Amino acid sequence: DLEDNWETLNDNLKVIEKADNAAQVKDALTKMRAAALDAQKATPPKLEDKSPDSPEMKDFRHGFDILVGQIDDALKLANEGKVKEAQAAAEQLKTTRNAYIQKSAFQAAYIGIEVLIALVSVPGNVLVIWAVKVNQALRDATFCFIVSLAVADVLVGALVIPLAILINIGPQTYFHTCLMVACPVLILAQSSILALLAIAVDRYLRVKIPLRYKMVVTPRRAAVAIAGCWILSFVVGLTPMFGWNNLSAVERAWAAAGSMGEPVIKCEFEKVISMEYMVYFNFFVWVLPPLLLMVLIYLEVFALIRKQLPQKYYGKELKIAKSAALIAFLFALSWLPLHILNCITLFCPSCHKPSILTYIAIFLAHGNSAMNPIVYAFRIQKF
Numbered sequence: 122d123l124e125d126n127w128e129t130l131n132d133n134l135k136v137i138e139k140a141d142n143a144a145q146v147k148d149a150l151t152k153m154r155a156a157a158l159d160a161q162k163a164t165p166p167k168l169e170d171k172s173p174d175s176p177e178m179k180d181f182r183h184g185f186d187i188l189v190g191q192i193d194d195a196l197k198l199a200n201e202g203k204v205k206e207a208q209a210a211a212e213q214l215k216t217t218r219n220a221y222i223q224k225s226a227f228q229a230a231y232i233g234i235e236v237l238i239a240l241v242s243v244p245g246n247v248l249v250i251w252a253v254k255v256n257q258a259l260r261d262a263t264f265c266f267i268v269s270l271a272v273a274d275v276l277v278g279a280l281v282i283p284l285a286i287l288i289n290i291g292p293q294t295y296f297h298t299c300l301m302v303a304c305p306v307l308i309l310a311q312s313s314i315l316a317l318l319a320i321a322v323d324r325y326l327r328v329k330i331p332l333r334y335k336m337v338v339t340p341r342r343a344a345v346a347i348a349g350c351w352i353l354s355f356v357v358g359l360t361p362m363f364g365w366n367n368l369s370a371v372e373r374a375w376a377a378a379g380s381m382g383e384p385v386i387k388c389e390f391e392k393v394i395s396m397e398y399m400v401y402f403n404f405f406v407w408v409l410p411p412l413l414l415m416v417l418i419y420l421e422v423f424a425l426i427r428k429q430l431p432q433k434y435y436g437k438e439l440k441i442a443k444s445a446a447l448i449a450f451l452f453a454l455s456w457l458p459l460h461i462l463n464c465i466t467l468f469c470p471s472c473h474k475p476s477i478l479t480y481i482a483i484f485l486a487h488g489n490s491a492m493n494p495i496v497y498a499f500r501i502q503k504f
């Protein structure tokens with residue numbers, strides 16, 4: 122009902138613009154008033170979810186009120202036999218059409234929640250960096266891993282989330298720009314995995330060989346190990362930019378349409394990254410094995426601390442070990458959903474997931490960065 126009325130507005134407007142006498146103008150204008158009044162009571166297909174009195178509907182009916190105004194002016198001029206001014210008032214109708222009818226509810230909640238997770242992730246991890254860095258008594262190895270991890274979460278709130286909003290609004294950009302958007306979250310996630318594993322190793326050294334601990338874990342070795350973790354995170358992270366991507370399909374569909382050059386796409390996450398890289402390489406190699414090794418390490422640490430029971434040092438190491446194991450478990454728990462979504466994508470391309478569960482998985486994956494400082498300060502209050 123609305124579409125045919127719209128096309129009657131268009132065609133009849135062209136009839137007035139191609140008219141010779143005033144009878145054609147007046148008749149076409151009557152038709153346009155009928156169709157405009159009949160379409161003012163309609164609802165656009167885009168506005169299914171918006172309420173009947175929502176601002177979109179009032180702007181719609183308002184624009185149609187202005188429209189019927191212009192139509193009534195042109196008609197009042199056409200009844201007087203002034204075909205010139207009637208055609209002019211017909212020329213204004215295109216401008217009124219341009220300002221209005223030529224121009225997100227579920228999505229806005231996602232955007233806002235992302236902004237919230239940013240406003241919790243950035244200042245909290247900055248606060249951790251303050252508490253450890255500014256204090257001179259906190260220049261340890263585990264403390265250095267903590268500092269690096271807090272840096273990673275700060276960058277998650279400051280980079281991964283802003284780019285996570287710009288990937289959702291989806292602008293039309295080049296292909297490589299979408300990779301440059303996609304890689305930082307890979308890098309930072311791998312960096313967090315390696316940081317947690319390094320904390321586990323440092324705990325195992327503090328509980329198994331304390332007698333020589335401070336003489337085996339030199340601060341030089343702390344810097345070397347941290348730098349190695351960052352480098353691993355960049356190698357595993359910038360692998361898609363090295364050439365492992367779904368550029369073949371995008372470029373094939375780009376040449377099938379006849380166009381040639383740099384492909385331009387919506388910049389979705391799924392179209393620029395090969396799921397073989399996410400599943401086989403980024404996960405089955407650089408996520409799951411480190412998790413398993415951390416499990417074995419923490420089991421050994423708890424075993425040694427349990428068998429070794431002055432008492433205060435080992436009780437303290439037990440508290441720190443509890444906190445570390447808890448944080449690692451919350452990392453794996455907050456990060457496994459997205460990975461399992463990748464695996465379901467690779468293994469069953471036909472099975473399509475409800476969007477709500479994906480939004481939840483992303484809320485967990487990005488939200489853990491805000492979850493770390495809360496649990497950390499909580500465990501400071503415990504000990």
Ligand SMILES: CCCCn1c(=O)c2[nH]c([C@@]34C[C@@H]5C[C@@H](C[C@H]3C5)C4)nc2n(CCCO)c1=O
Pocket residue numbers: 285288289306307310311390391399459460462463466474479483
């Ligand atoms: C260890 C680091 C994890 C990195 N990573 C992903 O692994 C990841 N998978 C996905 C999905 C969700 C939906 C079904 C499958 C294909 C696409 C689209 C799964 N989106 C991801 N995103 C970005 C999210 C915000 O747009 C992401 O950063």
